[PDB]
């Protein structure tokens, strides 16, 4: 009966992830968690692939806001500060989630209540590649001080009927941080890529530098972060541009809105679920046609070519090939919080709708 996972009552009322906000589903009850892209490096084998974090200045500053407290908490309570900081980054989307800022202050996505205080949120889950959402109560803290403390208490004390559920993440039980992240794989979240995501965060943000006895100087922290080789990629790397949130974080709709902004073009926040984008955009004075076009939003009608039967799908056109096929980028089709890409053949591409942003 692990409280961090979906309960029987939560699963009966499960929903498909919302792609748009309305009067019922809003920003105050929708989480934000870190997004990841597939590592462009050719892996040694079919199972050794990694994920790349979406690099960000918010993440760097979020690390500095808690690296000191995570370091001290780590040494005292036998916890990898790196794992703790990575989980904070992942679960709160580098501090940007409504669950992580005032007045909730829950940085680790811990469910339940704290000192009798709680806050309901829609939270994304996965059964392999089958994505769903559940509405659950999350611990509401007076500040981030009690959140960091409560995380350490969870790892050390565990749960009812399994007090040592997180004992294998303890520094004395796990030879390295990778042993610890692999045990969080099925005890903390349903996301089947949880460990690989944490490892990606730890590596890129050099979080092991906070695992040792003496903590380093935070003024030289940004100097240690090494960039990914992005010089031989075909397209501009993804980056979260805006602060505003017109669509639920990470969904296909949100991804296209943000990706379009990187190229200085916008699309409104009132287009609703993906399949309604083409007809609504057309009404709202956007150029919309069946001709494939570079950097346009590409819409799939409900149920079209495997797209979601109710919501359809929306993606961003990275390239229009000379043979008429298109290269698109999108989110949450390959897995939870995963940005992926593919090629749509010419005959299929000519049947989709392309929205030129303003
Ligand atoms: Na439509
Ligand atoms: Na499809």
UniProtKB/Swiss-Prot annotation:
Top-rank taxon, per record: Bacteria
GO cellular component, one term: extracellular region
Reported induction: More protein is secreted in a secA2 mutant, while less protein is secreted in a secG or double secG/secY2 mutant (at protein level).
Stretches for region N-acetylmuramoyl-L-alanine amidase: 66-207
Keyword Secreted in annotation: yes
Subcellular location: Secreted
Chief place where the protein resides: secreted
Domain Peptidase C51: 227-356
Keywords carried by this UniProt record: Hydrolase, Secreted, Signal
A GO molecular-function annotation: amidase activity
Sequence similarity: In the N-terminal section; belongs to the N-acetylmuramoyl-L-alanine amidase 2 family.
UniProt-recorded name of the protein: N-acetylmuramoyl-L-alanine amidase domain-containing protein SAOUHSC_02979
Species this chain originates from: Staphylococcus aureus (strain NCTC 8325 / PS 47)
Shown stretch of the complete protein: 262 to 619 of 619
